[PDB]
């Protein structure tokens, strides 16, 4: 197993951890903010996924400071992850094209 496949797996694990903690911490941050909708665990988990994927349906979002702080970690974890899968797919295509010219 090459470094880039394990970084990928690692990031997918790490991202899942961030999605889970993020759910739990989002609810902890938002309860007590009048008007908040990010306040039960099941839908925070859905919220954290749509935040890490940057799909932003706008059905749920944080309205407190620490909720927003939690959100940023999820977006960056989400974006770095999906980006690392790409950097991993590129080293693969690049290695497979250097065997394809002998090198």
């Amino acid at each position: 197993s090459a470094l880039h496949w394990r970084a990928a797996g690692a990031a997918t694990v790490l991202l899942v951890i961030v999605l889970l903690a993020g759910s739990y911490l989002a609810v902890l941050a938002e309860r007590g903010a009048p008007g908040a909708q990010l306040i039960t665990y099941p839908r925070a988990l859905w919220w954290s996924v749509e935040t890490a994927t940057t799909v932003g349906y706008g059905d749920l979002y944080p309205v407190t400071l620490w909720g927003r702080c939690v959100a940023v970690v999820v977006m960056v974890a989400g974006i770095t992850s999906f980006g690392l899968v790409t950097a991993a797919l590129a080293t693969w295509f690049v290695g497979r094209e250097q065997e394809r010219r002998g090198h």
Partner: antibody
């Protein structure tokens, strides 16, 4: 089983305070929230506040005079509500309820009957 | 805060008839409404969660419908054990809130 155990009654002199308890059994998860609800005789249900015992954060109903302080003892799975400086407006039954973090109160205590009198 | 309105406050029905309790919320709350029964000198008991989902231990006789701002709890064929106060409760927005209550009268 009985999941929330509350004392049946407390008498409180006007101006004094009192600490209601609520011992939980059954499944206790780290996600669990303990809520407290006030019901004046012949009136309805009134949400007072909530605490998450694993972490210790508590939130209160801002719309009513904040008479309460919420604490919890992780060791004994017991939640405390400290009502202070009581008047006859505060005489009521106080239920505790358990919410799994999914928005509904699955189970309730039998409630404690707080009487403010001399 | 979300305000849950329960009108009418009392409901007179004859035995075996079907009865319906109305919860109206002051804004759309999806299906995040839940129904409780409270008999005389008892504590509240959960009947229906998330508008319509059944709780085990609860008679088939009890059902719920609704979404958005209009919510209904129904009892196909009332009987005497159903005499109580019935409360709704929302979990869409913080803080949770309760309806004012409806009494069932046979």
């Amino acid at each position: 089983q009985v999941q929330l155990q509350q004392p049946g009654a407390e008498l409180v002199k006007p101006g004094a305070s009192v600490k209601l308890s609520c011992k939980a059994s059954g499944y206790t998860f780290t996600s669990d929230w303990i809520h407290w609800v006030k019901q004046r005789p012949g009136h309805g249900l009134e949400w007072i506040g909530e605490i998450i015992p694993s972490y210790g954060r508590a939130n209160y109903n801002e719309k009513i005079q904040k008479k309460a302080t919420l604490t919890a003892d992780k060791s004994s799975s017991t939640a405390f509500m400290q009502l202070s400086s009581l008047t006859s407006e505060d005489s009521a039954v106080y239920y505790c309820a358990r919410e799994r973090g999914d928005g509904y109160f699955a189970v309730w205590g039998a409630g404690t009957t707080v009487t403010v009198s001399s | 805060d979300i305000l849950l309105t329960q009108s009418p406050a009392i409901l007179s029905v004859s035995p075996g008839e079907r009865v319906s309790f109305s919860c109206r919320a002051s804004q759309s709350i999806g299906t995040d409404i839940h129904w409780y029964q409270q008999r005389t000198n008892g504590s509240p008991r959960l009947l229906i969660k998330y508008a319509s989902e059944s709780i085990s231990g609860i008679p088939s006789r009890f059902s719920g419908s609704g979404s958005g701002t209009d919510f209904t709890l129904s009892i196909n064929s009332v009987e005497s054990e159903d005499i109580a106060n019935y409360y709704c409760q929302q979990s869409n927005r913080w803080p949770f809130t309760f309806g004012s209550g409806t009494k069932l009268e046979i």
